[PDB]
Design an enzyme around this catalytic site. Structure first.
Site, PDB file in Angstrom:
ATOM      1  N   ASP B  16      22.829 -21.048  -1.539  1.00  0.00           N
ATOM      2  CA  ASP B  16      22.669 -20.282  -0.311  1.00  0.00           C
ATOM      3  C   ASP B  16      22.584 -21.172   0.919  1.00  0.00           C
ATOM      4  O   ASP B  16      23.200 -20.878   1.941  1.00  0.00           O
ATOM      5  CB  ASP B  16      21.424 -19.400  -0.385  1.00  0.00           C
ATOM      6  CG  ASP B  16      21.581 -18.233  -1.347  1.00  0.00           C
ATOM      7  OD1 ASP B  16      22.723 -17.919  -1.745  1.00  0.00           O
ATOM      8  OD2 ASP B  16      20.552 -17.619  -1.702  1.00  0.00           O
ATOM      9  N   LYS B  17      21.845 -22.269   0.812  1.00  0.00           N
ATOM     10  CA  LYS B  17      21.694 -23.188   1.932  1.00  0.00           C
ATOM     11  C   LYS B  17      22.944 -23.989   2.244  1.00  0.00           C
ATOM     12  O   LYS B  17      23.114 -24.464   3.367  1.00  0.00           O
ATOM     13  CB  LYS B  17      20.501 -24.112   1.721  1.00  0.00           C
ATOM     14  CG  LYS B  17      19.358 -23.835   2.680  1.00  0.00           C
ATOM     15  CD  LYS B  17      18.863 -22.408   2.562  1.00  0.00           C
ATOM     16  CE  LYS B  17      17.913 -22.071   3.686  1.00  0.00           C
ATOM     17  NZ  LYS B  17      18.609 -22.127   5.001  1.00  0.00           N
ATOM     18  N   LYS B 238      18.716 -16.429   2.600  1.00  0.00           N
ATOM     19  CA  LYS B 238      17.453 -17.166   2.526  1.00  0.00           C
ATOM     20  C   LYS B 238      16.686 -16.965   3.832  1.00  0.00           C
ATOM     21  O   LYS B 238      16.161 -17.907   4.423  1.00  0.00           O
ATOM     22  CB  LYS B 238      17.703 -18.649   2.250  1.00  0.00           C
ATOM     23  CG  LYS B 238      17.100 -19.131   0.951  1.00  0.00           C
ATOM     24  CD  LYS B 238      17.586 -18.324  -0.237  1.00  0.00           C
ATOM     25  CE  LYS B 238      16.877 -18.776  -1.508  1.00  0.00           C
ATOM     26  NZ  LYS B 238      17.358 -18.066  -2.728  1.00  0.00           N
TER      27      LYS B 238
HETATM   28  K   LIG Z   1      17.666 -12.157   1.673  1.00  0.00           K
END
Ligand SMILES: [K+]
Ligand SMILES: Nc1ncnc2c1ncn2[C@@H]1O[C@H](COP(=O)(O)OP(=O)(O)OP(=O)(O)O)[C@@H](O)[C@H]1O
Ligand SMILES: Nc1ncnc2c1ncn2[C@@H]1O[C@H](COP(=O)(O)OP(=O)(O)OP(=O)(O)O)[C@@H](O)[C@H]1O
Ligand SMILES: N[C@@H](C[C@H]1CO1)C(=O)O
Ligand SMILES: N[C@@H](C[C@H]1CO1)C(=O)O
Ligand SMILES: [K+]
Ligand SMILES: [K+]
Ligand SMILES: [K+]
Ligand SMILES: [Mg+2]
Ligand SMILES: [Mg+2]
Ligand SMILES: [Mg+2]
Ligand SMILES: [Mg+2]
Ligand SMILES: [Mg+2]
Ligand SMILES: [Mg+2]
Lengths: 368, 368, 368, 368
Positions: B16-17, B238
């Protein structure tokens, strides 16, 4: 003690929500044939292109093409121009599937629970209205009343409040913003009219509608072939609309696509349960229950009840009430809340909290 | 008034990052040649497969292959076994690029701001430690000190607290959970040792480390070829680790991939700014500033300051302080905070709030 | 009557051939549980990304992840640096699967058959050597003799010929070009040496190797991390290497991924069968049998035998021989050639014609 | 010496041909700004999803989104139901683009050339009719005459022949099979009628149409939303329809997506050139010119002329004619045939050989 608040919600056609639903549909499809199926999947979509990813250890025969396409059909994507057609879209399945009470919580965690008496659902008026607004549009869509209505929609409700030697009492709906996908043969004037009379006024209590209430219906003009496209749709990206509309607290854990063994889902449900139970039992008008877990340990590693001076009992009077009425251990939660049941898809849209048809929304007795 | 809290963070290698960073890298790449570039993009990744999606109206010549691969390289993905190699991964670009003070806020919105004096950063200890823990590992990775360390990591810090006729004072670190990707030639025993002495004890203040503090280092055993797959990484997923670790409030708006014209980013930064300024100015020990906007209107549609009885001034004395020291209109925000500058990529990891190197983290004077 | 000819072949690691194999692997996987399974699928690959597409009406439970990954493993892609790893590659399955003697040929068609006595296989020396060259490398790879050898390879063999009051007699191998993927720890000098002594001289008959024969071993230098990448791998794109190396005639029909009901495969096999039978029966030294079909009609719509003056019987003497020894109707072909058997994967590489282990390569008696 | 033959062709909407065109469109787009651009790309498509892959070293600014979408538009894919819409389809570009007379042939090769006097184009009647049949349908589609006609189509023409103390004279069209995509509002009876009167009878010479000629128009019923899916379209998979319809010989080399420096394209064109020149110059009625090249060497490594006893000059009298009239070295070919010109897209459909508008189709004088 005036202040205002805003919340939002999206329809079943919103890219992110399509993925949340598809992911939960796959979860349901497994639970029906194996209630112990281990599901951990997510979906990604982009203009007639759906990608099913995930790792699921189960022992059930599932037709992923069928479960994905059926879900897209249910949402209302059957024609081309709508931005999705279950009969023609690309369903790329990159899914990996294997075969083979005092358990113990996986992953250090901290779940939150929230409830307020401003509505019968025990949820913030702002988010309740936001959800109901989208719900009504789907009804009119599926009934035939508003046949120009399409799956993708977005709703925002901002209500003016005022505290009360405890907390949070809604006064009126300041402004409402609603955007919905639509067919070509329907004027912007007719849409905005139908949205105010047939959807907004049919769901929002008279007490809150005003002569000054601001309406922003189809602000950006048209939204025809928009559909689920955006630039991409994803699972677990609508975390706040799935909960309290920004009113409680949220650690960041996503629900959709994860089975009942993940504390992120189960424990969050359990926390909502006790919160709703507390207010329903008259023990408070607004609560923020905080349940912490320790990796390996089954019994919760400290639960905190946060009333805003709305309780007469007093925190650490109410905690014993919770400790005498609830057993928040992971395994017990799934058993008491019947979490092996395939109800997850209907939970994937219009919010996880609020609707009484879910186990965690049925208040427990609370013997005090 | 004891209670406990937990927060988490992820390393630059977390799927995600990576997407958050890549998306912001593309934003930076445009700002450098056109500070008025309109960026709205997102990224999706899955085992040596990166998908760049988005709509960006700009007038700058960018090599997307270069900006994506460079970002993957920066993260530390240069070898095969790591789960990603910038030289070999598939970079599918489906990006669409066009060419051509009292503005007015886009989209009805409600941004939150938070600050507490429990740390010099004015951020919750739990999330600060969580971030710093990941930061240190990247340092040791890039320095050479711990050459077995790989990009992907996850951190969780749970601290025991106690209120104080106002609010929130950390007492000790109850337990720490840290998982990090690694090379094959390194024993689980050596890893866990290095994590405790070289990373944890090198960042966590002595005052908080205990003889009872619980450590869960590499709980799940080995995390070798665990490179960015995590069943598809995504942008904007995130949301809580990018903010306050679940301590303030969050409406659900994502930052990464959106330019400075989106109130979701700018106004959120502005809200943090005033919050940090307030506590720094001694006007309170803990604040939750709430700024609302109305679509079309430039001037904020009601700002609310929420101290927890930690201020002597009194809400609606502090509001005037904010109204006399701040001009939270969208356009002014970008000008005052220098939001046309390409600093967004470094904002895409280790948290948006806390680090002093960002404009919004520099406390304003506050003339009272 | 001198002239020269060149032919080529690719190893099991060639992108296109990986897809041909994967597609046929899926065909085999269905035949084993349902010999009447209707298979029509194709594969696309690109650096650790395999896409399975297709429409297959069958009644068998298949794990496509398993059949794709097993095929990649069989080919020799187990490590990262090789350009493919069956354990880590992305297998996106977009496959659609349903459930439910004098038949009649589908689709107007024209199949070709070819055979020549220049080799015991009844196939052109140029293509036979080209295939055998790749075959040997796989052996040395799988045995351990040449452990630096990797799956992807390409071979080209050009032989000088001379007619003979009939046709085609090979004289010598003019030049040989061979390129093969490899590991890093092996010098270009050692590779080229091994290719000449251990592969070329171990398969090419002494009679054809010369002191002037030209060798081009690893011409483009290194080919290490090359692997199946190219820029993409596809099914049915290696049509000539699957047949006669450009010696007979080809209508353009692809084999791999299509079941036994498609005349493109079955009838092509049948045509090869009769061709091989004719030369084997001494009725000619070189034949080009041409079988035409009419959509709907079962019995072939005109078969033509093309000897190059190598037969003593005379075309339309040989036709009656074929009409008295063969029943080329689609249904009879599959029955006589046992085409419901899962042998298609081994047919997906190193050529469809030539190898005696296939039904169509076993010469029929021919009673004259 | 009777025998029959069949050939096929596909319309601009056929999945494979869309990729061939898109790939060549990208080639044209580069040649216009850099005639020395090194192009090596291919395309893959699947229901509103186009993937551009490739390695191209050029110094020109190209908008790949524009060149792909424009090509899809040109083909006729502008509406949803057609199976493709240039405005909505996913164009994933994974293209890698760098910046920086007696040359010498790359890669050992063997190109073929063919020509016959049975038609003015010097191409087999079967393939000529097959192409023209598709061409006419596109005309009626683009003119408006047959507005129900859609881009995707397939054509098959089988003609009965008879030798002639030399070779190949067409007698009559035995059967014609044509399938074309279409709109919903058009009866199967009206389609079949229009196909026979307006397309078939408008292109096929009266001499060949019979009272027994078999017609199979839209055999499989309806072909409506049959847009480009065909279970994934690909580049270079229609190798025989791009050449002689299975009449000459083919080594397997694909044209589309490769620039003029690849002998697979250039030399094949050159070989066609000399073949057409020979028959046009009365030196033969049917030829199969075979040109071989050696890696590194510029001058062709042996050219072979194959008349079928249709020449009076005698092979190795005709070879000197070719050696005195042609300079088949790679570099000279591109110069003489003007191969740096962007004409490749129009070459990507309806056949590479036959149409006089291409350089290689203009017969050279031939001084004898
Ligand atoms: K989320
Ligand atoms: N071209 C652009 N220029 C500026 N901003 C953009 C652009 N394209 C998208 N955005 C931004 O990002 C968000 C929209 O993305 P998306 O395509 O996912 O559509 P949606 O799912 O139909 O909308 P939403 O999720 O916001 O309810 C908006 O809030 C907007 O600010
Ligand atoms: N950058 C480039 N510049 C010029 N030509 C190229 C380029 N990249 C590829 N090609 C061409 O197209 C063909 C190579 O493509 P591919 O990447 O499919 O590899 P392979 O499958 O390992 O090789 P092959 O299929 O030819 O045996 C070659 O014949 C070459 O002429
Ligand atoms: N699809 C967008 C707006 C439409 C007009 O482009 C939305 O849902 O707000
Ligand atoms: N992979 C290419 C050549 C290598 C050197 O780049 C081939 O198979 O011929
Ligand atoms: K985002
Ligand atoms: K090609
Ligand atoms: K082909
Ligand atoms: Mg919206
Ligand atoms: Mg809007
Ligand atoms: Mg939203
Ligand atoms: Mg090769
Ligand atoms: Mg080479
Ligand atoms: Mg090749």
């Amino acid at each position: 003690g005036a202040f205002m608040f805003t919340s939002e919600s999206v329809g079943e056609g919103h890219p992110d929500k399509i993925c949340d639903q598809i992911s939960d549909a796959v979860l349901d499809a497994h639970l029906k044939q194996d209630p112990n199926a281990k599901v951990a999947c997510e979906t990604v979509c982009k203009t007639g292109m759906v990608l099913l990813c995930g790792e699921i250890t189960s022992m059930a025969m599932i037709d992923y093409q069928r479960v994905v396409r059926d879900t897209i059909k249910h949402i209302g994507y059957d024609d081309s121009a709508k931005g999705f057609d279950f009969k023609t879209c690309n369903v790329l399945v990159a899914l990996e599937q294997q075969s083979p009470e005092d358990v113990g919580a996986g992953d250090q965690g901290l779940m939150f629970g929230y409830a307020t008496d401003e509505t019968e659902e025990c949820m913030p008026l702002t988010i309740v209205l936001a959800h109901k607004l989208n719900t009504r549009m789907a009804d009119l869509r599926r009934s035939g009343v508003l046949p120009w209505l399409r799956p993708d929609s977005k709703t925002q409700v901002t209500v003016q409040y005022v505290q009360d030697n405890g907390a949070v009492i809604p006064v009126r709906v300041h402004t409402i913003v609603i955007s919905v996908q639509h067919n070509e043969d329907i004027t912007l004037e007719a849409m905005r009219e139908a949205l105010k009379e047939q959807v907004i006024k049919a769901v929002v209590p008279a007490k809150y509608l005003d002569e000054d209430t601001i309406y922003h219906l189809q602000p950006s003009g048209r939204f025809v072939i928009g559909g689920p496209q955006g630039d991409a749709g994803v699972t677990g990206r609508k975390i706040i609309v799935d909960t309290y509309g920004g009113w409680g607290a949220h650690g960041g854990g996503a629900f959709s696509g994860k089975d009942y063994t993940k504390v992120d889902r189960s424990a969050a449900y359990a926390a909502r349960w006790v919160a709703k139970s507390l207010v329903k039992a008259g023990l408070c008008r607004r609560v923020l229950v905080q349940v912490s877990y320790a990796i390996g340990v089954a019994e919760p590693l400290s639960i905190s009840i946060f009333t805003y001076g709305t309780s007469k009992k007093t925190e650490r009077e109410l905690l014993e009430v919770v400790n005498k009425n609830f057993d928040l251990r992971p395994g017990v939660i799934v058993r008491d809340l019947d979490l092996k049941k395939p109800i997850y898809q209907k939970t994937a849209c219009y919010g996880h909290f609020g609707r009484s048809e879910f186990p965690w929304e049925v208040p427990k007795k609370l013997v005090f």
